[PDB]
Design a protein around this ligand. Sequence first.
Ligand code: ANP
Ligand code: ANP
Ligand code: J1O
Ligand code: J1O
Ligand code: MG
Ligand code: MG
Lengths: 305, 305
Amino acid sequence: DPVAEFPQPPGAARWAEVMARFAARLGAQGRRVVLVTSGGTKVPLEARPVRFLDNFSSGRRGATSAEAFLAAGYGVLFLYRARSAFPYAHRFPPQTWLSALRPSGPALSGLLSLEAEENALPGFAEALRSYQEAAAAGTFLVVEFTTLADYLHLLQAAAQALNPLGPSAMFYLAAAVSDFYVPVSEMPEHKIQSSGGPLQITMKMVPKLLSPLVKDWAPKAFIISFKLETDPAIVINRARKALEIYQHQVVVANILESRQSFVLIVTKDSETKLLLSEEEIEKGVEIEEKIVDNLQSRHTAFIGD
Amino acid sequence: DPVAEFPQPPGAARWAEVMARFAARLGAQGRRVVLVTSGGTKVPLEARPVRFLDNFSSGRRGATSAEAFLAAGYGVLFLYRARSAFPYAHRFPPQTWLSALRPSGPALSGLLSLEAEENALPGFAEALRSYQEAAAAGTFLVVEFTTLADYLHLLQAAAQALNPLGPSAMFYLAAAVSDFYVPVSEMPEHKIQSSGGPLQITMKMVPKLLSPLVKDWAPKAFIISFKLETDPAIVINRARKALEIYQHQVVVANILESRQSFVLIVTKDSETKLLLSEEEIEKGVEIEEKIVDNLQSRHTAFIGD
Ligand SMILES: Nc1ncnc2c1ncn2[C@@H]1O[C@H](COP(=O)(O)OP(=O)(O)NP(=O)(O)O)[C@@H](O)[C@H]1O
Ligand SMILES: Nc1ncnc2c1ncn2[C@@H]1O[C@H](COP(=O)(O)OP(=O)(O)NP(=O)(O)O)[C@@H](O)[C@H]1O
Ligand SMILES: CC(C)(COP(=O)(O)O)[C@@H](O)C(=O)NCCCC(=O)O
Ligand SMILES: CC(C)(COP(=O)(O)O)[C@@H](O)C(=O)NCCCC(=O)O
Ligand SMILES: [Mg+2]
Ligand SMILES: [Mg+2]
């Protein structure tokens, strides 16, 4: 009903079924399942679009969280912005592997052999192994989106898939979702002309689907949202107001500039600081391992009670 | 002067020098040099930005053109949107190589060995080889941008670097450049609130720097622009008007929906259709090889006359 005015992504019915099969198989083994949403959505201004209003998100938080959930034993349904950061691969950009990998001869017997200095691709072998172990166990399903429209439909299909697991399902909503849009009927047909003067656009508020998600689509699930602010004077109050309005369990609050090194875990009655050490930034650890460790422990208590 | 109101990207002075050294070394060997710009720019709406107005461009046209220019003997200065399509690598996304590559043992003597089914990564060895040959010859310099501000400053620094080569330099301007912006003084300081009603924004026209580029920064260079339209009734007229206004040599015209299979090469007095065959889409060829073949031949005639 609120999602009906947005066009469906290609293959939406096929995706919904694939997601339903994934979750039902993992629930049958007794495993917990998390929907990790990651990256930003965009919205068009024209019917044949050449420009988009895009919410900022590299996808690092989501990708790194998916890795940490996989290592903790969860099944992961990874709903992500196409081309944003991908689990295990995101530490090895194109120029790194293009210059490090070298063929060790021509391909013989249908097999290509490659070599690299280990110190040029640190952790590369462990990345390939982790990804391949998850694919083989069937614990990692990837679903791409691009537009706000694609995201809203796929999020509704994922919630339908996870609703049968009751409290064993977790939603980890890290995606940066467009707050404004132009409805299909008010868009010009063709490219906007820059010689036609300043661009004056009014964009309507996107309906906040966290209400129906929590109340109707997945009412028994353990639901975690993120709250992004730029102003440190107001972030706590804004995170608490989110819980009051939407009635879900936890908010992970963060400030744009410090987001890689600090989050605040906010509930209705408490706040917990998670700050990365001097002795932890050296020994390799990422903030997402500490988030996931706090959340899995909370999820255990939620399932048991 | 028109670029002064935009902030400089980090290391702008270091980049300008690196670019100047690249071009001077290639000109000393007698080689032609092309600036390929690729990907889209974005502009912020807030001083601490969480959202951006982004012009659409995958970077495929630019990446594929850089490959074809390298194979034709040019030196290539590749000014590109960070994370958009990268030469040689763009045919092998993360999930393709994550599942295909496997370690053949632990790393011994500091060397990591890997293998893959050749049919899972077709062309992979030839990609590594081409990239490594260009790095070794010093014919390929990569320069990243993200914002409109970063792009405008780096484009001016590249033009300064290529100006000493006179007619042996080519500009191939495929980047999708923001047409509107919000000046530093009219931006709100903090994240815009979605509960505050519809978003109403007026954005000023970005000044068209193709005029000073052609008239002042690189007046002897062979300059090729792109013209993107969505409406096939008007594209030819718009491409001709661009040449009349900016006074450069060639426009590569294209329609959004058919851009992978068709361009029109437009000059002041002629148009040339470049359409990819049935017998060419099978035998592998891309439209950018046919573009580059038409352009290099034109560049020869421009240098000689
Ligand atoms: N502000 C700018 N400075 C430098 N180059 C630009 C700028 N804007 C566009 N370009 C380049 O100019 C060429 C034309 O882009 P295009 O968007 O088709 O036309 P336009 O001149 O921007 N007018 P419009 O159709 O209103 O967008 C392309 O090669 C772009 O890379
Ligand atoms: N329209 C939506 N539908 C579903 N989830 C959303 C939507 N908008 C935001 N979210 C999620 O809601 C949480 C809050 O996002 P955030 O941008 O901090 O607050 P907001 O509710 O959008 N209000 P504001 O601060 O004005 O943007 C995040 O987990 C987002 O993924
Ligand atoms: C800041 C963000 C996007 C993580 O950043 P990144 O994807 O790791 O660059 C994250 O932690 C978060 O706060 N997500 C909710 C964003 C809210 C919105 O604008 O919809
Ligand atoms: C359409 C485009 C961006 C190539 O697309 P893609 O980067 O290959 O997805 C190209 O051929 C082109 O026409 N570039 C000029 C775009 C003009 C603008 O919006 O600034
Ligand atoms: Mg928001
Ligand atoms: Mg334009």
